Design a protein around this ligand. Structure first.
Ligand SMILES: [Ca+2]
Ligand SMILES: [Ca+2]
Ligand SMILES: [Ca+2]
Ligand SMILES: [Ca+2]
Ligand SMILES: [Ca+2]
Ligand SMILES: [Cl-]
Lengths: 366, 366, 366, 366, 366
């Protein structure tokens, strides 16, 4: 993804206009091939009108220009763009929320699966490795960047997400369907094994572990659903036809006609259709928002950094359940033990502008 | 469903335009009968204007063409299309989310219902068979493809979802209503039987099983609600009248009049209303998005593959609770036991483009 | 409700157009009185223009027709129709989801409240009768069809939802507010009584029963909220004024003026304003979608069948907790015990069109 | 709130038009001062054009009228009205859902906090009084009607929501922030005290009590968030400027010019701009929907009856946990004990129109 | 944030118009630099048309003015403004809901972590300090105001959110990623330590503590997701190009041409484009709603007061778990113990307007 959150923290004078100078993840990277072929096909029709066509063929083409400018209905293209892109954006955000993230599991695992010995250490890592394995298996199914990192299951074994013994049981499962849910079943068998030996101390801890896994597994199942159940193809084709019919109407209907015939609204030569160019940046760019986000798991610049989230979850969950298992600093009194209230100090860059009346409710200054 | 997720992974130059060459689940499969009758009725009026009508009947028809072009309000058809299709798409996605999927149940069942013996094996399979039975019974009520696969309850018995003894108790239940919830009540009786004999070891395991079933049963109840409570018929008829009134206005109001009378905006002969054809692809295709998705359980190409999801859930849940019950690979140290951190390697097709600064927050490059 | 889900299963050639032949729950049943008075008031103005008005009064009326056609802004009526009806449809669907349905309670009750004896049988039925009683009491408050079925509380006693002893405690509660929540408090007292005598065997079962009831009771409270907190009246009046101002503008502004004065866009006589009639079917029908759904608990054809849902829930929950309490078929091996995988067979009407490659992910055909 | 749910139960012929005769909570109560000043400023400009201006000053004003009618863009005002009011309506409904309602707490308290003695009675009432106290404290912060009922905390003590001993501990808490969450902390201390003495019998009961309180406390925190975090002021000002610029354009651009100069679309005298008046009812009334609902806790007619909900919750929860604690009618057989099925009878006003085939699914009439 | 909730409590006559006099968080503070450069560039073109250009260069510029007024399509800018700002507002509200608030944790901690001694006191404060520490660490990552208050981790140690011993374990964690989740792992280690020593008395209390923390930790993870995954940059650039192309079209297309050439719709001199100025307040202000809210964690006036919420949560949670741990007022009878019902009194400013029939349901006045 292209992150510009710091650029737009405060609404400044040229704020969104300086985002028109970015190139990575931009409209210009997405549209310049389409803009050059649209403008090239415009100049080719404009040059045929000037130097190629005979005088009676120019009059017929002039009647064709006035015809197509009637059908350039720029207003209804916006609704099928507005409703469709909002659908794609809604799917795009829920696909990010369905990312297999092991943070909720790693807090349950470090709190409930016990033992400083090598066995309890191996219980905690294998539970997190199985959650990470289900993450890798569903992301190499839906994300082309994860798939180029893990083209085979042997790549998942040499990366350490799966072992060779787990590889044998994975491949010997007779199922024609995608086996991303298999380490989630291994998680339940491992947690039930840990409950039997008392490494999970109580049944509410074991229940919390299985509630947390089902939340994780249903997120993996949701990424498979979004990958399988596309935005409906008829709806993608309707918005594509509506945008391209508008631009077919524009490269004839916005041609600069010869002013000597006195056609109204056609008394000018610019030899570049600059406001049709800006309409192309608007409407074809609005469609490119959907074209970038309809599969947010490819290698667009604004697509999800799924290999980063795999490396983050695997490193952090192994960090949380192995090194950080039961090493607190000793319980020690804070700065505000002798203090009835508790307020942290401000720097000089925040003390001066803040420190203003605390909001108590709207009805109190009555 | 028609899945084109891999085609649109990266936003390419001709990306959405190559989806206009697909036929399965396309606008062209949905609209070509309507387009040929619209264009045929257009050419029939155009031929009556040329060769049939007398010269004074042509002038009256010419006044009728100018009348109907005033009422071709292409803008308000788009709002009742945009708001209605978004409602249908919202129902269509929530109907997919309400699909009876046994994955969350199969992780609880393999983790909580215990025993390698034939009895505990039979407990785990019957719990999954009862969840799958409620899935088949609600899907043959709402999906025509499941219903043609299971036309009678005897078809459900010969498919193995129900047994002959379960068939007797199913048919002897005196209820006039659909009995899809009956195996969910059998699930609760079976899980309570398994808790009594200690195959479910603790009450939090038994509670998790019943929470998971109620989530499954309410998904089955939601598919019945969507099947029963349609999109409101008055709202379907308003969008149908609005689209067809627009196209009734178009096959008169876009007729190519004789240029010798000098009617403005009517100085051309194309003998094919090509931009009215593209408007028909836009508006009637936009309605066809709703017509395909209003019942997503029929045999449209873009309808849900409900027999596939039945075969997947039954095969996977039987695979998860029978063969995969308590056969882990032995707890064995990963690649990153001697390693404080944990990073999986990259292939050459992903190492070169990735490996870029880790995002820590927007405020840190301040 | 009017259910047409089977009619629109597959998108057919005349699919939504055959729904324009339905009468029950249709636009024509909702609009024909309004259409006849609109067309009657149109013909009355058209007849006054032809035979009543003098020649100088016709010119003033002709200036009035050209005035009102300027203000027929058909575009902004659509936004206040599109945004308002979507609000009403959103409330209409959430009101259906808030229906008091006892299925989630009946699965907990049959799984947790125990005993084949007459006492445990009476515990299970009274818990379901109290849930059904809260359903009847909130639905006779919000639904006119339930209220005509239960006009008094004595009707609820003779229907068997309440007993005479429960009637005394119901009427002796000193509260000015609606007492639909009273059997939900009786449910909690009954479940706590059953936990004390061990008919509820464990505390997690008793907790699940009370979580399930609070979900049921908050659904009853939500139906009271929707009944009390209407769509805001100012917003209902704004959309009513916007639609009727448009149609006031239309029955003057679309009058067929005398062509001898040569008023432009007014050179025709149809003596029926057929495209204004179709605009009336569009806009007034779009408002009628809201008028039918703003209270979905009346006796519109497309209103909820609330007496059916009362009869279904009472019959099914009594069927689930009394006859179906702990009578499973004996645990018996399925068709797929000797089979490593598990696939159900297809009929000849589904084997031929299906059996096509299983989707594994989008990235795998790379 | 103004409740008209019974008026719109069945979609009738003059149904929404009879809601234009209501005055309480109406557009006319909200708009008549604005309509009289708009029409008064219109007539003042119209009278200056007739009797005050000289003949050359009338021509300049006539050029000003034709200028401002070009900028009366009634279409884009509707989008910033449609999107903004939908945001306000969404906040308005979620603010009603965040109302502190003690029904879910009172069902847990009567089911889990035990004892017929005066101590257990005092435990149940104090738990409900503390929930009601947090309700009063957050509603007097956000609702002007609750604040005029409880202007001081001493008013809350004389109303009985707080005691004098609780008043001392409330005032001696050193916190500059609003202390609405303080009785929720007292609830947790009281429930933990009741668990220690076994008035709460099991830990799952005590956990359910604390889950239920956190749902209640987060609803109180949500009302504080909505009160603090307004609809953004820039967005309120944009919709206010857009509506008033349109109406500034209208009281010049819709002036009836002198027909003797022959200005087109200006050949009439009405001396009342009746369709501009109806546009004012549309657009300024649409803004008044937002102006009424942006703070739904004031004393608008359509604002929430927050003092009613305080009196309802306090009376009902004291009724539920004190008098209704453990007085069931004795477990007694229903009307349908000797009956395998269970159907309640119909009155003559509902038997005749109902009793129609039970819906089983869409696929069954195949 | 700029809070005006009390100003708009009752819909008054000049209600939203008096919000056009506010300056803090206003359109005028956001737009005046853009308005002065737009009007300055307008007057510069207007002065070049009057005094600089020759008479034949004025005619070419006049043809350019009529060209650009054709492309000022004010209608489609509104849809890409309406759909985009609604997306930004939806993200802005969910970012406020994802704020790390310790109220739900502090009610569990004071109810479940026990002991009046210094050890149990230190357990309760350290659990709340660790929740507050994760709040500070994620807010200094996403909020520039928190970051200027805590520029280093040493600032977090001198503020008392972290200790020096906790600082050593924080810095010695080998992770390249943001370590905001580290005190949430410390929370789980501390709660598991407290359960082992019986300061947490039961396993359901310990489970509730870990469910509550995972809700808190996922809110911290959600703020990181929103900070990382921006509104997509192509969509921000499309709405920026659409607004600025419209205003590029306006500062030529709305130029006041010389009336002596008799250009239609151009017969006036105002020498200030006042309705183009109001359109600039509309459209550029509508974009400024998004520009203020796209990062709601900066130092805009309408941005979130994140340092206030840090100081509130830290002061209140230390107040709730230390001083308010197990000091109830003694269980004492309320005002309504001898009263069967329970109604609080009204002041004279609320008794007179209220006391009106209690709503029982819509169907009861039948
Ligand atoms: Ca992409
Ligand atoms: Ca279909
Ligand atoms: Ca109705
Ligand atoms: Ca208000
Ligand atoms: Ca900001
Ligand atoms: Cl639980």
């Amino acid at each position: 993804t292209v992150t510009y959150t710091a650029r737009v923290a405060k609404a400044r004078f040229g704020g969104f206009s300086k985002l028109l100078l970015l190139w990575r993840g931009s409209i210009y990277k997405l549209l310049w091939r389409e803009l050059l072929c649209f403008l090239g096909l415009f100049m080719a029709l404009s040059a045929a009108y000037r130097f190629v066509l005979t005088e009676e063929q120019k009059r017929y083409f002039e009647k064709l220009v006035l015809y197509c400018d009637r059908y350039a209905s720029l207003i209804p293209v916006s609704f099928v763009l507005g409703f469709y892109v909002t659908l794609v954006v809604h799917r795009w955000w829920n696909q990010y929320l369905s990312m297999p993230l092991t943070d909720a599991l790693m807090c349950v695992v470090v709190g409930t699966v016990h033992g400083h010995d090598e066995r309890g250490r191996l219980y905690r890592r294998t539970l997190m490795r199985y959650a990470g394995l289900s993450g890798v298996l569903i992301l190499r199914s839906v994300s082309t960047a994860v798939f180029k990192r893990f083209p085979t299951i042997d790549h998942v074994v040499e990366a350490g997400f799966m072992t060779r013994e787990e590889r044998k049981k994975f491949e010997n499962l007779n199922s024609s369907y995608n086996k991303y849910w298999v380490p989630c079943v291994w998680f339940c068998n491992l947690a039930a094994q840990a409950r039997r030996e008392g490494r999970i101390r109580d049944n509410g801890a074991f229940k919390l572990l299985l509630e947390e896994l089902n939340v994780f597994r249903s997120k993996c199942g949701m990424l498979f659903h979004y990958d399988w159940i596309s935005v409906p193809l008829v709806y993608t084709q309707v918005v594509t036809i509506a945008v391209y019919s508008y631009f077919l109407a524009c490269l004839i209907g916005r041609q600069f006609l010869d002013p000597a015939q006195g056609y109204k609204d056609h008394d000018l030569d610019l030899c570049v259709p600059i406001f049709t160019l800006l309409q192309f940046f608007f409407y074809a760019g609005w469609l490119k928002v959907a074209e970038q986000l309809i599969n947010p798991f490819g290698e667009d610049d604004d697509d999800f950094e799924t290999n980063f989230l795999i490396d983050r979850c695997f490193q952090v969950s192994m960090l949380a359940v192995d090194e950080m298992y039961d090493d607190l600093a000793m319980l020690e009194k804070d700065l505000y033990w002798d203090a009835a209230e508790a307020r942290a100090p401000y720097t000089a860059a925040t003390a001066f502008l803040m420190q203003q009346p605390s909001f108590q409710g709207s009805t109190f200054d009555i």
